[PDB]
Design a protein around this nucleic acid. Sequence first.
RNA 1: GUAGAAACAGGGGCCCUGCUUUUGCC
Length: 670
Amino acid sequence: KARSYQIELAQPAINGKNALICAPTGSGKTFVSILICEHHFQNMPAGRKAKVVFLATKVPVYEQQKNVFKHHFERQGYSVQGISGENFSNVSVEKVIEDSDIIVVTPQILVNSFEDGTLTSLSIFTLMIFDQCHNTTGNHPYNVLMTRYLEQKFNSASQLPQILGLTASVGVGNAKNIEETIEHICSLCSYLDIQAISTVRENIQELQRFMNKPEIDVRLVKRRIHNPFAAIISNLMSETEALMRTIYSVDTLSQNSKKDFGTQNYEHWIVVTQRKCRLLQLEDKEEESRICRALFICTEHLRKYNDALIISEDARIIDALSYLTEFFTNVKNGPYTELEQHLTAKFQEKEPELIALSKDETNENPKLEELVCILDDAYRYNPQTRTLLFAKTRALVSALKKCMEENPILNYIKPGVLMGRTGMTLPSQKGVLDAFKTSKDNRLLIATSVADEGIDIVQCNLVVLYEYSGNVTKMIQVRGRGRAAGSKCILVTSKTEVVENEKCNRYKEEMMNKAVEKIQKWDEETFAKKIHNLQMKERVLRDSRGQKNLLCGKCKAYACSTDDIRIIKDSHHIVLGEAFKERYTTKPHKKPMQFDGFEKKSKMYCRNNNCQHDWGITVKYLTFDNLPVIKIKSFVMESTATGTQMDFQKWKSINSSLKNFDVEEMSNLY
RNA sequence: GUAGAAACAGGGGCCCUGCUUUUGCC
Ligand SMILES: *O[C@H]1[C@@H](O)[C@H](n2cnc3c(=O)[nH]c(N)nc32)O[C@@H]1COP(=O)(O)OP(=O)(O)OP(=O)(O)O
Ligand SMILES: Nc1ncnc2c1ncn2[C@@H]1O[C@H](COP(=O)(O)OP(=O)(O)O)[C@@H](O)[C@H]1O
Ligand SMILES: [Cl-]
Ligand SMILES: [Mg+2]
Ligand SMILES: [Zn+2]
């Protein structure tokens, strides 16, 4: 049965308009899309049949919505099917579309199907529903599809499906006022060819009875007064930078650092330095290799020190020390050249003091104590509480898991951990969430942004954001995880910037809502004209728009020529010939699974034992075993014409100049 | 293989460009 705000929201789309539905998370936007579907099905003109596609950005959501529509519509005699990457391969997409009244998909499935010629026109659909439609932007699959929709609209020799978009936040982009916010929202509208924005105006009070927007609480807590740990590590980082200058004048390559150790700014300095160092070209190739490798290692070490600093700010000294000791264990197990031995020793020199510092309990993190106090208060007051605790990085989430494991809240509450996809698998993720839902003692969940939206999580009465800031849409989603009766959302930070950030988000949320009500004042003509002008602008922006050797990204040793490379299925870059087999060595893949028609066999590495750089994998494919598949990020390209060296993060530039795989060519190579 | 977001800063005169962090998708 429908609520009145649900009926209200469905009205423009029921009248056949391309509609954008803005309504709060969990308010029942999906139920609204179902009401529109029902109406769609019944009001088809003579001789027409409906074909609905529901698009979802993620597999969990894909699965949830698939089963919603199955349950709602199969009992009414409708055929409801779904395609995701998990079955894309074993089904014909054309056939599924042919046999189905409603099809639910992840959007890339459709993109793949246009690109491979399976589909030619979007006229096969009468209604396209885009869950989380605010993702229609840039090179997102949603926007690839809507670009195709608009290209067809512009060669208007066909009828196009109705568009429906579901979101809880249209966003504001870079808007600083109502006017620029209005521009941003209209842009989104133009990308989706919207004709009406549908919000709750008439039935606001009923909405407010079902939805309870948590009271936020923003707490600024004090940092450590002294951080001896960070003094030490910083000196090591200074030592390491000076050693780096000894090796090669990085002043002639990159700039000198501002020694702002343990900052994002430093993090990005090291990253820029790395790319410059690896693009070093010398006459003497032996020296190029020697220098580049030693700078590779130095920058790697500098990054880990920086990481350890940042970890120590948000967590315990021991968590930061653990991170480094695990790293150095790996150093000791790798090539472990003389330079790596030197660095490990300089560290082990200082390690006794660090172990000492990490054991002092007056050397404890104020911000982490405050976190623990917050949790203790909640579970003391209400032991039924279920908490969702968010933090930015995997390293921080791991640290917080260890904390809450070794120091359980009120000495009984146990944490679960949720990270993205060692990551976690979707089965693992689901396992964790089920425990978090049902368990008596597992009432705390620690998560990265994996938990912001989409995947189904039991409602929480406490949401804690631990130095976890972001944009207005993130804020809106994250609060939607806290809708249990008398829920709180608490932002814990030691940074005024983050407090101001959250102050801005409040402004923008209210700016956004005001911007929408102004747009809703306009008549259809005014709106339609505006959206059209932007589609025309977008269109005019689109109007405007040799042989190389690959070198080990680390030791600069010759790998292969671009002439030896073949592309399989536009994605996978294999290397032909016996010569290349001399250049690498393999180890069994630790996860030897199958995907895209390929079976993973091995990891590939630079054969240079002093390097051992990861180059990719080997696979079984068709009638071929142990095909090497290289990844672009492991290599530096060098032009055979100019001699000059290039870095590339994506194949996209190069692919134009590479031959495609030919099973007949391959067959002759034996 | 590749997409979004956020942070950090090289180019154009507010977009472009990269980078990491993070999540995703095939
Ligand atoms: O360049 C990649 C790519 O060609 C192929 N590949 C690996 N993972 C994926 C994937 O999720 N999706 C697609 N389309 N293609 C993929 O293998 C090449 C090498 O990649 P990696 O070296 O990262 O391979 P793998 O993930 O097995 O290494 P690791 O995860 O064990 O580090
Ligand atoms: N009118 C209704 N009657 C009963 N349950 C409803 C109703 N509207 C929504 N729900 C329930 O609310 C939950 C959230 O709805 P959903 O459409 O997923 O929200 P949204 O897409 O707006 O985030 C679902 O479990 C759904 O069954
Ligand atoms: Cl070698
Ligand atoms: Mg990989
Ligand atoms: Zn190498």
